[PDB]
Amino acid sequence: TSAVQQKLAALEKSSGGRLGVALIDTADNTQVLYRGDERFPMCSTSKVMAAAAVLKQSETQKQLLNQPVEIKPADLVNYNPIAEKHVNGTMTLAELSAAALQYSDNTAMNKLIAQLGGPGGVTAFARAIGDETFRLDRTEPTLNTAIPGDPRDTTTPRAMAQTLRQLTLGHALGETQRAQLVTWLKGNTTGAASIRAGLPTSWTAGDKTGSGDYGTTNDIAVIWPQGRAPLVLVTYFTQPQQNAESRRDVLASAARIIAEGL
Numbered sequence: 640t641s642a643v644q645q646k647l648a649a650l651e652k653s654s655g656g657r658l659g660v661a662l663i664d665t666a667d668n669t670q671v672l673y674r675g676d677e678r679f680p681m682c683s684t685s686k687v688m689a690a691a692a693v694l695k696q697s698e699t700q701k702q703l704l705n706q707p708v709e710i711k712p713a714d715l716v717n718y719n720p721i722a723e724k725h726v727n728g729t730m731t732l733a734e735l736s737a738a739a740l741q742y743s744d745n746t747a748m749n750k751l752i753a754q755l756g757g758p759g760g761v762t763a764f765a766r767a768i769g770d771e772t773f774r775l776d777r778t779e780p781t782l783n784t785a786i787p788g789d790p791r792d793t794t795t796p797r798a799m800a801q802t803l804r805q806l807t808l809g810h811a812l813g814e815t816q817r818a819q820l821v822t823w824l825k826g827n828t829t830g831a832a833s834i835r836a837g838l839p840t841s842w843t844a845g846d847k848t849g850s851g852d853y854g855t856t857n858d859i860a861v862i863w864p865q866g867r868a869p870l871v872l873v874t875y876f877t878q879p880q881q882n883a884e885s886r887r888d889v890l891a892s893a894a895r896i897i898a899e900g901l
């Protein structure tokens with residue numbers, strides 16, 4: 640147990656919930672883990688895997704991101720800030736990827752999942768890039784039920800950090816696709832209260848948040864600190880009761896602990 644792990648344990652204790660953290664510092668490839676091998680519901684952080692899987696498909700279909708997808712009234716689910724504007728029209732796979740990643744549009748996610756054949760197509764991509772932990776089992780919105788002990792739609796902090804590293808900094812995607820993924824993450828609109836709230840303001844980052852039942856509050860980030868090699872940081876948090884409140888502040892606190900531990 641490290642000093643950082645003890646600080647994270649103290650944060651967790653005061654939070655009422657269960658906290659999972661994985662850091663990869665690409666300066667030396669060292670890691671900080673807290674419940675790094677425990678499963679957590681991914682909620683919308685799973686949109687990164689789906690968008691990346693479609694990016695992978697686009698490596699062999701140069702026009703794929705321009706492919707139109709019909710958006711019908713019946714397609715709308717519980718959070719559709721972009722898709723609702725396009726009902727009875729179409730969105731391209733690029734537009735759907737951007738909407739999913741940058742606005743957490745759940746209808747957009749469902750279209751990405753459908754493009755991959757269903758939830759298992761997202762899991763298959765995870766396996767293809769060496770992630771043996773990630774599983775997507777359901778579509779939006781039921782993938783957010785976040786029931787304690789339920790393995791559906793879960794991963795571990797360790798696995799997600801490794802995957803995010805490979806996708807954004809490594810060779811899991813072609814260079815153009817990696818750059819597009821990073822551009823999308825860096826343009827996220829939903830992240831200022833989560834990991835990034837705990838980081839020095841001079842640092843830059845891209846991230847994808849998640850939220851669900853059981854007050855599940857998540858964020859996964861790639862971070863460029865001032866004067867340091869990039870970091871990959873995953874912070875997952877979930878609570879014992881179904882109607883628990885969101886706790887983005889806990890993720891900010893975890894990130895601050897990590898940052899001050901560098």
Ligand SMILES: O=c1c2c3c(sc2ncn1Cc1nnn[nH]1)CCCC3
Pocket residue numbers: 683684718742743829848849850851852885
């Ligand atoms: O914010 C929510 C929420 C919230 C919920 S459910 C939900 N679903 C999507 N979204 C959009 C989202 N942004 N990043 N990941 N998902 C309960 C209260 C707290 C906010």
